Design a protein around this motif. Sequence first.
Motif, short mmCIF file in Angstrom:
data_model
loop_
_atom_site.label_atom_id
_atom_site.label_comp_id
_atom_site.label_asym_id
_atom_site.label_seq_id
_atom_site.Cartn_x
_atom_site.Cartn_y
_atom_site.Cartn_z
N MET A 411 -8.96 -3.14 -3.30
CA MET A 411 -8.88 -4.59 -3.26
C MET A 411 -7.54 -5.11 -3.77
SD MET A 411 -11.22 -7.30 -5.35
CE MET A 411 -12.67 -6.62 -4.54
N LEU A 412 -7.10 -4.59 -4.91
CA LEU A 412 -5.83 -4.99 -5.50
C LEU A 412 -4.64 -4.61 -4.62
CD1 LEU A 412 -6.32 -4.17 -9.29
CD2 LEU A 412 -6.35 -6.39 -8.17
N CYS A 413 -4.77 -3.52 -3.87
CA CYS A 413 -3.72 -3.11 -2.95
C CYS A 413 -3.57 -4.10 -1.80
CB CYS A 413 -3.99 -1.70 -2.41
SG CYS A 413 -3.70 -0.36 -3.60
N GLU A 414 -4.71 -4.60 -1.31
CA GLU A 414 -4.72 -5.57 -0.23
C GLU A 414 -4.13 -6.90 -0.69
OE1 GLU A 414 -8.86 -5.65 0.63
OE2 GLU A 414 -8.91 -3.67 1.56
N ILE A 415 -4.54 -7.36 -1.86
CA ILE A 415 -4.05 -8.61 -2.42
C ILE A 415 -2.54 -8.57 -2.69
CG2 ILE A 415 -4.25 -10.24 -4.35
CD1 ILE A 415 -7.11 -9.48 -4.66
N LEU A 416 -2.06 -7.44 -3.19
CA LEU A 416 -0.64 -7.30 -3.52
C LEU A 416 0.22 -6.85 -2.33
CD1 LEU A 416 -0.92 -5.72 -7.08
CD2 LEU A 416 -0.45 -8.10 -6.43
N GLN A 417 -0.44 -6.61 -1.19
CA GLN A 417 0.24 -6.24 0.05
C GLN A 417 1.05 -4.95 -0.08
OE1 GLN A 417 2.57 -9.58 1.40
NE2 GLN A 417 0.80 -10.97 1.53
N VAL A 418 0.41 -3.92 -0.63
CA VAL A 418 1.02 -2.61 -0.76
C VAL A 418 1.17 -1.95 0.60
CG1 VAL A 418 0.80 -0.29 -1.70
CG2 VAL A 418 0.11 -2.27 -3.08
N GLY A 419 2.37 -1.49 0.92
CA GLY A 419 2.61 -0.80 2.18
C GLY A 419 3.17 -1.74 3.22
N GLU A 420 3.81 -2.80 2.74
CA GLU A 420 4.45 -3.78 3.59
C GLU A 420 5.95 -3.73 3.42
OE1 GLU A 420 3.60 -5.68 5.94
OE2 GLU A 420 1.48 -6.23 5.79
N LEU A 421 6.68 -3.94 4.52
CA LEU A 421 8.13 -3.97 4.45
C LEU A 421 8.57 -5.42 4.37
CD1 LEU A 421 7.54 -1.04 5.07
CD2 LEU A 421 9.03 -1.23 7.09
N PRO A 422 9.49 -5.72 3.44
CA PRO A 422 9.87 -7.11 3.16
C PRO A 422 10.62 -7.77 4.32
CG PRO A 422 11.38 -5.62 2.08
CD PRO A 422 10.31 -4.76 2.69
N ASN A 423 10.33 -9.04 4.59
CA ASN A 423 11.06 -9.78 5.61
C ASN A 423 12.24 -10.53 4.99
OD1 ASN A 423 9.96 -12.17 4.42
ND2 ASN A 423 8.16 -11.99 5.74
N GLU A 424 12.93 -11.34 5.80
CA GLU A 424 14.12 -12.02 5.32
C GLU A 424 13.80 -13.43 4.82
N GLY A 425 12.59 -13.90 5.12
CA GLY A 425 12.24 -15.28 4.88
C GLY A 425 11.52 -15.63 3.59
N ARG A 426 10.74 -14.69 3.05
CA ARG A 426 9.88 -14.99 1.91
C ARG A 426 10.63 -15.12 0.58
NH1 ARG A 426 4.58 -11.20 2.05
NH2 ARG A 426 3.92 -12.71 0.45
N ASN A 427 10.16 -16.03 -0.27
CA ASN A 427 10.74 -16.25 -1.59
C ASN A 427 9.67 -16.17 -2.68
OD1 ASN A 427 13.27 -16.72 -0.44
ND2 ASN A 427 12.94 -18.94 -0.34
#
Length: 508
Positions: A411-427
């Motif tokens: 559950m904590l992995c899903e919430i923290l978005q583990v295994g995602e590659l960062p985009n250029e837009g998010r802050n």
Amino acid sequence: DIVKVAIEWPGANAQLLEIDQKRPLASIIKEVCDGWSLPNPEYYTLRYADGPQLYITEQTRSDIKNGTILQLAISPSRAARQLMERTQSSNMETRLDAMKELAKLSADVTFATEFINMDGIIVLTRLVESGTKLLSHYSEMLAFTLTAFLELMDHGIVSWDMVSITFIKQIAGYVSQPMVDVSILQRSLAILESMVLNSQSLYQKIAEEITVGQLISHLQVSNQEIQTYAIALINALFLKAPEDKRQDMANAFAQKHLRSIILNHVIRGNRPIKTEMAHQLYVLQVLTFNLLEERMMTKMDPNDQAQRDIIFELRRIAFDAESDPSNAPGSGTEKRKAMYTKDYKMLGFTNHINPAMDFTQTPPGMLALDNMLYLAKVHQDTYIRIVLENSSREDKHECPFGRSAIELTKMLCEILQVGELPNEGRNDYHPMFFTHDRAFEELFGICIQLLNKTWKEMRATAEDFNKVMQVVREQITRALPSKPNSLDQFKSKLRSLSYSEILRLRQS
């Protein structure tokens, strides 16, 4: 179609034209030069008067909207040639002004292509490696050169493999040395970052020229822009590190207090955090969370005694102290296994006999096991209380530790978005993870207590397992947007977000 524009020329009235898009640019320019009585129309090219003032070609002429203001400018090829010659001038004020114009025009791909095709890249790097260092505006001249060099390289026309390695070594030396001119540092960091992000070979060369501590030291300054390109270079190193070597690199930076330095100099800095910096913090946080991915998708090997020993340790910490009788030998091998199996039932594992099978589920795999051991070793008081208060599976209202901890980790992995590659837009980033060296493991500890509090607040049974987890997920998700600057603050909002509270908040 036909678009109306105005074209400008210094010290003369603008011309108002109806541009025929079926008509060639060369013809239009010829007519324009006729109006201003200008010889050699082949010398010139159309260009936007405002904004970035980009050169206009036959392929980009479609973007010219009605009422656009243009200027008749020297053609990109002729300008590139003039500027390159002025960079080999005997006069140096000539070269400073030439290089300043190169720093501006090199952002335009139309100009860059021309300048690069004139052996431009090596012209610049050779100015850097063997220029005259004795003069009044040396640092200023160098700064513009580096700016122009980088902008040329950022068009994806020239491979970093072609750039002189002694040039790169020199630039890296500007970063490793105790202090360099602040603007020279910024250019150097930006260059090294781009080199890393856009190649493979040169990436290995940076770890040789520059130590971890030196790169981190550029975070300990007041200049926010320096900090930003310092973390940008660090984020680049993490991002393009081979899966093989990412964990060691994170260890090396951690052992030199990368987190706490960012915590004190950036998050707890004097000046406000700007947009560019916030993005790099987001990127860093995403990359650090991604370290958990390997263990998250790692299935436990039930046949590995070294991995089973971890579970044995969990059972040992829970149930075997000096207050308990001695399972001395004489107690059959079948009898000792009977006690082990009950312990695993009391621990809330699904497979009572071989609990190692519970961790073959990926996600969360071995990551769930690491979290349990962390809880047992670092917060024994919490671990002990939880497993002993929920030991008897005969009691229908007790909460299974094993099944819960596994699910919670997922559950904590899903919430923290583990295994995602960062985009250029998010802050967006969660500040509290910058306040502890093992933030994810501390989070698990807090949430497993939460899980048990919420479980007993719902008077739940084994049949209501999924229902409880759904509530716990919501409790954690709701506490985050308040953006706590510590784990204690996060724990505080969880106290207010009890089961009686969350139920009230969807009546709304």
